[PDB]
Amino acid sequence: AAPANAVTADDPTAIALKYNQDATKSERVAAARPGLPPEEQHCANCQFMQANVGEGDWKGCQLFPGKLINVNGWCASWTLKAG
Ligand code: SF4
Ligand SMILES: [N+]
Ligand SMILES: [N+]
Ligand SMILES: [N+]
Question: Residue 61 burial by CB count (10 A; 0-12/13-18/19+): exposed, middle or buried?
Fold first, then answer.
């Protein structure tokens, strides 16, 4: 059961970025974003995930203010967590 503030499927930004809560049901391969092979990409290893926001598997994403994403999710703004 997703948190009340989870990013949802008719969120316009989620649609535009092709977010999914489950990276295995994402188009990460098609996008081929740089920094890791696409099968290795998900929110937990993304620069925009906010480790100090949320709880458990439901964490912040800077691009989705006021929302939570799933650490196992993905979107097309995936960028390696570098610092
Ligand atoms: S920007 Fe990164 S942390 Fe935010 S939803 Fe996309 S992949 Fe997940
Ligand atoms: N939500
Ligand atoms: N597609
Ligand atoms: N956030």
Answer: buried
Range of the domain at 57: 1-83
**Nearest ligand atom owner, CA of 64:** 4
Domains: count for the chain: 1
Q: Which residues line ligand 4 (CB under 6 A)?
A: 50, 53, 60, 62, 65
Query: What residues does 69 pair with on adjacent strands?
Result: 59
Resolution, angstroms, 1 dp = 0.7
| Experimental technique for the deposited model | X-ray
Which atom from ligand 1 is nearest to the alpha carbon of 69?
5
Fill in the amino acid letter for 38. Answer: P
